[PDB]
Each structure stands twice: as structure tokens, then as C-alpha cells.
Nucleic acid binder design. Structure first.
Ligand SMILES: [Ca+2]
Ligand SMILES: [Ca+2]
Ligand SMILES: [Ca+2]
Ligand SMILES: [Ca+2]
Ligand SMILES: [Ca+2]
Ligand SMILES: [Ca+2]
Ligand SMILES: [Ca+2]
Ligand SMILES: [Ca+2]
Lengths: 299, 299
DNA sequence: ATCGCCTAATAGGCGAT
DNA sequence: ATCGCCTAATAGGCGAT
């Protein structure tokens, strides 16, 4: 199966990736389109999102005796691992609501690695936006929840959540991304993205990758004497440029105007030097364009 | 938030769980309804499921240099960890298709633990089926993929994927399941389900839990000289009774007619004695009713 | 057939500096 | 503020018996 459509994918990928790389504005258009599409959907279904999210706390009796156990160094002991509440009540719910949009068609293309949510989003809006280049994009959305004890202004991303330059030299070969040296104010690390900047499906469909991050932020009610629960406080939305934009054109990752866009992640010295996660600073990403947004969900 | 609707949930849960327990046929009806609903949907969208699944192999060049690394004891070295392909192309796709059914409404109720897919499925069909008892159920669906080198006739389930008796003695307390001693032909282990047999939402909604397992089975093409890829071969569907049916009425877990329905799982002697996974033998589960089905997807 | 040996990959709370 | 210390929970391939 590996070789059946390989030549056609190879030829199309290389011709199309060059075009994308030389015309960064097209990718930026569809990336902002994806971002604003999530913002719209969260806005149009705010009560539902908050209700199904916060419902986890009301269902407390059903899981109180079997909560996810604490993990990490020195847990304070008053928080409940809230990872899956944001993943389902926010992340999965959004995937369904996006597909219910009148003009949008969703296709779950099989891939062995990647973010929480992945799907080919096809729509006539993308066709005009890209002036006929394509009518589809590969949505790569990952939910990153935090409480009042972690930073609400960063993103810690795994290699499988970032795309690179994706050179594909020879046919019998494949896409390869260059290692990147992340230099922060005090430390540095290597970061190697594993995702290609775009995909070409076996039927010739051109699917530039659009990386979106949804960051639900909960409040710890217990921080207030005798109150209980971890309620939906806000949701940050962030668009991270695909690999061509980050490392090729306009090369945001190397622009002095945006120093420390990337910084060392949370992986410890026991992790493989090539699988370490990287941080993206939302305060800097906020300067390269209308890439970040905050929605108040505490109402 | 923990106490705001607690009394109402408590009162309703206990009255409703007693009714469910004493009328096992209602739960069996909705459980078989959920099973047959997935069978219908897989059947009505077979080309799409197989196409988006198998597409992962055609996209080989895009991930060949960054495949999920091998894990476990003595990997042969010719297989690619295929976990996420089945999760998305089959599991996530089904959740969307079920919600697109005319008469079905889906709600992603937040929960901190549980299976791959979870959602409140509401429909008038459930209302007549349960003769007015309720119009909703909590779908608990987990995707379990296997290749030609693991058994296509079992399921290895985590505590968070099985419900128990769910006694809830006192209000300020919560649901609790009894530990179960799993006795297999050569070994034995404890198994402690963490999920309640039903949920009551803060608005009084009665949501009996319906546990469904989707088992995509891929073929290893490479097992045939020079061919490549891991293609969709079959999909097994299995309905596992909720906790009331397993351990209370009719108590399938303790019925001599179904010896070894459950058996020790895959967790090693280094795992907490209370978090060990348990196996469910599909060949036995197949005897307690029309709980198991096989769909040929290799066409 | 039984069953458990064995490890990749994801996640974010929280302290140390 | 920076950044990495630290561990729960999920998963199924495959050998050992
Ligand atoms: Ca605690
Ligand atoms: Ca639509
Ligand atoms: Ca994830
Ligand atoms: Ca995530
Ligand atoms: Ca290999
Ligand atoms: Ca519907
Ligand atoms: Ca899972
Ligand atoms: Ca699963």
C-alpha cells in the first residue's frame, strides 16, 4: 500500500509545498480562518460548553471514590486531575459542532500520530480564501487545560503537535524536518517536529495543516473557604504557524522581533534529547498577528 | 459545586438504581440498542470507514521517518503501532455519525475518567424502549485494535471501562463498587470497576451506562512477501453488561453457565493490586445473548 | 489456549531558582 | 519569570508456559 499512490503524492506534495512556502499569505489566511471558526463556535454554544464542562463537578459523587490519582512532583493534594473534562466537554464537543456547520464537511483521515483532534475540514470558504488552491485543510487541534497553579500564557507542545520544513528529497523516501535549537533566556534544547507542513491524500487532495490550540482554564473554587469544584473560567485559542511559516517564510521562529516565541518545555533530563516538548509563549505569538484570543466562560 | 444538587442526585440515583437492578430487561434493551446502533452505522458508512482507516498507509511517506516507536517485550520489528488509526478513523468517526442520526441528540458530559468516547445519547427510541423510564443513556465506547499477533477474541479492560454495583450509602458519600475476584483457569486477580452502573445529571436526567467495545482488526500485508501496510480487516462489536447485570441481576459474572467470562488481564506484577486490567472473553460473552458481532471490512 | 512481561507517548501541577 | 522535576493512566504486541 505504501507505494500505490506514492509517485502522485510525491509529485504533488513537492510542487504544492513550494507554492505554499513562497506564498505564506495563503497559509496564514486558512490558519486564521480555522482559529476564528473555533472562536465562533465556542461563542455560539457558550452555555452548552460551560454546562457540560462544569457538570463534572456536580457528578462528583460518581467519581469521588475513584478520582484520577495525583501525579508529578509534590502535588498539593487539593486538586483533581482535570485533563479529560476539558478534552471531552470542550475538545470533542467542538469537533462535532464544527462538522455541524452548514458549509463544512469533516473527514477523519487515519494517521498513527498527532494531536487530540484531527480531521480534514473541507469548505467552499477555503476554496475562495485560497483563490482555488484548495478547498480543504487538515485541522490539528489539541486541548491544553491548566488550573490557577500553572501558566495561562504558554503551550507545551510535543513533536507530534508541530510541523517542520518537511523536505522530501527522494520518492522511496519521505518527509523530514530539521532539528531546531531552542534558545531560551537561561537554557536551550533541541526540538524536532514530526508533522509535515501539509498532506496530499491518495486522491490528490491538498491539505495544508492548521495547528490550533484550545486552552481551557478552570478556577479552583476550594481556594475560597468551603467552596468546591473546578469550574470553566476561560478558554484561550491560539493559532501556531505551520512549519513553512515558522522556519521558512516568514520564518517567525528566527525573527528577532519575536525572541523566545519558543522556549524549553517541561521534559526532564531523562527524556530522549529528540523527543523533548517545546514551549510556545502566547505573549509573543500574540505579536506575530491575530493568533491568540481569550474567551471569558465564567458567566 | 459538589453539594449543590447532591441531594436530588442521591435520592433519584438510589430509587432509580433499585428499579434498574430489579428490572434487568430494560438495561439489556438499551444495551442491545446501542450495540445495534453501532452495527448499523458501521454498515451504512462502510466505504468511508475503510477508506479513512486504510488512508494512513497511503500517507506512509508523511510519517515513515517519525513512526510511533516500538514498545513492549520483544517487538518483532515489522509492525507500526496502529492504536490511533483505529481510534480516529473508526472510534471518533462513529461518534460523529451517530450524532448525525436524525433522531439522536448527543451531549458531551464532562467526566474526569472513562473510555475513549463518552456522551449522553438521547432519543425517543430509548423512551419507548424503556417504556418511559428514560430517553437517555450514557454511551461508553472504547476502541481496542489488534493485529494478527494478538487475540481477536478478547478485550482487556481498565477499571475505568467497567461499572460495578455502585452502592451509595450516605449522601455526603458517593458510589462505591465491590472488589471482584477474577478466577481464571490458571491464575486469579482482583478487579475493581470504578464506573457507576448509571448516572443522574444535575437536571435529573437518568442515564444508564451502556458499555460498548469496538475492536478494529487489521491485517499485516507485509506478512505476504513484498506487500506493505496494515489494512482494515474486520471490526468486532461487543456489548458488556453494566455492573448491575454483571454482579447483581442476572449476575452474569457469577453464572456457572458462563465460566471465565472474565479472566486476568495483561498487567504485570508491578501494577497496583487494585488497578489491574481484566479480560473479557468474547467467546463466552457471545453466550449470554446477542452481545457480540463481527463485520468484515476487507472488501 | 492462558496470562503477564514490557515500554512508548501524553499530560500539567508545582517547586526550585 | 524560567524551566524541569516528577508520575498517573492508556495501550496491545508477543513470548513464555
Ligand atoms: Ca486530594
Ligand atoms: Ca456540515
Ligand atoms: Ca492527547
Ligand atoms: Ca491535549
Ligand atoms: Ca520497524
Ligand atoms: Ca441527530
Ligand atoms: Ca484511550
Ligand atoms: Ca481504546
Amino acid at each position: 500500500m505504501y507505494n500505490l499512490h506514492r509517485e502522485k503524492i510525491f509529485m504533488s506534495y513537492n510542487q504544492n509545498k513550494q507554492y505554499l512556502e513562497d506564498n505564506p499569505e495563503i497559509q496564514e489566511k486558512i490558519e486564521l480562518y480555522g482559529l476564528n471558526l473555533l472562536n465562533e463556535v465556542i461563542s455560539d454554544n457558550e452555555e452548552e460548553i460551560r454546562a457540560d464542562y462544569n457538570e463534572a463537578n456536580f457528578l462528583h459523587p460518581f467519581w469521588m471514590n475513584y478520582p484520577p490519582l495525583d501525579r508529578g512532583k509534590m502535588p498539593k493534594g487539593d486538586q483533581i486531575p482535570w485533563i479529560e473534562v476539558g478534552e471531552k466537554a470542550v475538545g470533542s464537543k467542538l469537533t462535532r459542532l464544527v462538522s455541524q456547520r452548514e458549509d463544512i464537511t469533516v473527514r477523519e483521515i487515519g494517521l498513527p500520530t498527532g494531536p487530540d483532534e484531527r480531521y480534514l475540514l473541507t469548505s467552499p470558504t477555503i476554496y475562495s480564501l485560497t483563490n482555488g488552491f484548495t478547498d480543504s485543510i487538515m485541522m490539528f487541534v489539541d486541548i491544553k487545560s491548566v488550573g490557577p497553579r500553572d501558566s495561562d500564557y504558554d503551550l507545551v507542545l510535543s513533536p507530534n503537535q508541530v510541523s517542520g520544513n518537511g523536505d522530501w528529497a527522494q520518492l522511496e523516501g519521505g518527509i523530514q524536518n530539521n532539528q531546531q535549537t531552542i534558545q531560551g533566556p537561561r537554557s536551550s534544547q533541541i526540538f524536532l517536529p514530526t508533522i509535515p507542513p501539509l498532506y496530499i491524500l491518495s486522491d490528490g487532495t491538498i491539505a495544508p495543516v492548521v495547528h490550533l490550540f484550545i486552552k481551557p482554564i478552570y478556577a479552583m473554587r476550594s481556594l475560597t473557604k468551603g467552596d468546591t469544584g473546578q469550574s470553566l473560567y476561560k478558554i484561550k485559542l491560539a493559532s501556531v504557524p505551520n512549519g513553512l511559516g515558522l522556519f521558512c517564510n516568514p520564518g517567525y521562529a528566527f525573527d528577532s522581533a519575536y525572541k523566545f516565541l519558543f522556549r524549553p518545555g517541561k521534559d526532564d533530563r531523562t527524556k530522549s534529547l529528540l523527543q523533548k516538548r517545546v514551549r510556545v509563549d502566547l505573549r509573543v505569538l500574540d505579536k506575530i498577528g491575530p493568533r491568540v484570543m481569550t474567551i471569558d466562560m465564567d458567566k
